[PDB]
């Protein structure tokens, strides 16, 4: 359970002389904060087993910056064994608190994928032209998980695959779709707005796709900025299931 950090020059491959900290406690999750140190090293945060947070390089400037920006940092830990999701805040004094918590019962559903959208992507067109000389706004939530769980019932006729669009900050489940009579393995891609998860259909014995597109109203709610705490309008979901005539890897 003990985790270690190895710092190296990615060009030459040699370990950097900066001794990485010794992660004494087992860790659960890690974050690559976009904040950078003076030497343009992106701050990295680790959450240990005692739910404490260890920064790196964790200098005074780094400590100050992330202590001053603490309440805007949220972790989410997905315990697949218990079917639990937890979301923790970041206190000023480098401590975490139980912000939100959900439990998907492992007795009927086991979490199999927690695919979130890539952090290093951009969206060019915030909205899309719907014709009519009108625009339909995409539901660009940057803190949107796409937790996909399988049915613990392995029967070919009663199996199902659930997909929950749980938020990453407030813990709100935007969508809780459950496709019946389907079985894994499921290969899901999460992008700017849409998600696409391939699966097996036991009833008809055929690999099937299912594209979920998230759209807002004809007019954007909060423009200037997006906050997961300021989205009282549940985004509309567009779904479509396609047939894939082959397997997938």
Ligand X SMILES: *[C@@H]1O[C@H](CO)[C@@H](O)[C@H](O)[C@H]1NC(C)=O
Of 222, 233, 239, 240, the residue at the interface with ligand X (CB under 6 A) is 222
CB 126 within 8 A of CB 136: no
Instruction: Using DSSP, state whether 70 is helix, strand or coil.
Output: helix
CB 214 within 8 A of CB 193: yes
- Which residues, 4 to 43, sit near ligand X by CB under 6 A? none
* Min CB(65)–ligand X separation in Å: 23
* Min CB(6)–ligand X separation in Å: 41
Of 38, 120, 224, 247, the residue at the interface with ligand X (CB under 6 A) is 224
The smaller minimum CB distance to other proteins, of residues 9 and 71, is found at 71
Looking at 14-22, 53-61, 90-98, 224-232, which segment touches ligand X (CB under 6 A)? 224-232
The smaller minimum CB distance to other proteins, of residues 162 and 184, is found at 162
* HEC per residue, 169-198: CCCCEEEEEEEECCEEEEEEEECCCCEEEE
CB 48 within 8 A of CB 25: yes
72 binds ligand X (CB under 6 A): no
The span from the CA of 10 to the CA of 14, in Å, is: 8
* Min CB(10)–other proteins separation in Å: 21
Of 230, 236, 238, 242, the residue at the interface with ligand X (CB under 6 A) is 230
* Min CB(227)–ligand X separation in Å: 6
125 binds ligand X (CB under 6 A): no
* Min CB(230)–ligand X separation in Å: 4
Dihedrals phi, psi of 160, to nearest 5 degrees: -150, 165
The smaller minimum CB distance to ligand X, of residues 11 and 225, is found at 225
In the numeric block, which tokens belong to residue 234? 């549940």
Of 122, 223, 232, 247, the residue at the interface with ligand X (CB under 6 A) is 223
Instruction: Using DSSP, state whether 8 is helix, strand or coil.
Output: strand
Q: Which of 152, 154, 148, 144 is nearest to 228 (CA)?
A: 144
* Min CB(128)–other proteins separation in Å: 8
Q: Which of 128, 107, 18, 112 is nearest to 62 (CA)?
A: 18
227 binds ligand X (CB under 6 A): yes
Dihedrals phi, psi of 43, to nearest 5 degrees: -65, 135
In the numeric block, which tokens belong to residue 105? 């019962």
CB 73 within 8 A of CB 65: no
The listed partner (ligand X, other proteins, none) that binds 134, CB under 5 to 8 Å by sort, is other proteins
Of 11, 19, 22, 225, the residue at the interface with ligand X (CB under 6 A) is 225
* Residues near ligand X (CB under 6 A): 222-225, 227, 230
């Amino acid at each position: 359970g003990m985790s270690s950090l190895y710092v190296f020059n990615p060009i030459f491959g040699k370990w950097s002389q900066v001794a990485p900290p010794v992660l004494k406690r087992p860790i659960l999750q890690s974050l690559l904060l976009p904040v950078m140190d003076q030497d343009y090293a992106k701050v990295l945060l680790l959450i240990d087993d005692e739910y404490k947070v260890t920064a790196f390089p964790a200098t005074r400037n780094v400590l100050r910056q992330l202590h001053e920006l603490a309440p805007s940092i949220f972790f989410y830990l997905v315990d697949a064994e218990q079917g639990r999701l937890c979301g923790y805040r970041l206190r000023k004094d480098l401590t975490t608190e139980l912000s939100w918590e959900l439990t998907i019962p492992p007795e009927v559903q086991r979490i199999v994928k927690v695919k979130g959208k890539r952090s290093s992507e951009h969206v060019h067109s915030q909205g899309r032209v719907m014709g009519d000389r009108s625009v339909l706004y995409k539901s660009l939530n940057p803190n949107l998980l796409a937790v996909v769980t399988e049915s613990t019932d392995a029967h070919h006729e009663r199996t199902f695959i659930g997909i929950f669009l749980i938020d990453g900050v407030t813990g709100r489940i935007i969508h809780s779709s459950v496709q019946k009579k389907a079985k894994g393995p499921v290969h899901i891609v999460h992008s700017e707005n849409w998600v696409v998860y391939q699966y097996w259909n036991t009833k008809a014995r055929r690999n099937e796709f299912t594209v979920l597109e998230l759209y807002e109203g004809t007019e954007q709610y909060n423009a200037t900025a997006f906050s997961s705490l300021d989205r009282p309008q549940l985004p509309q979901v567009l779904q479509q299931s396609y047939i894939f005539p082959s397997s997938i890897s």
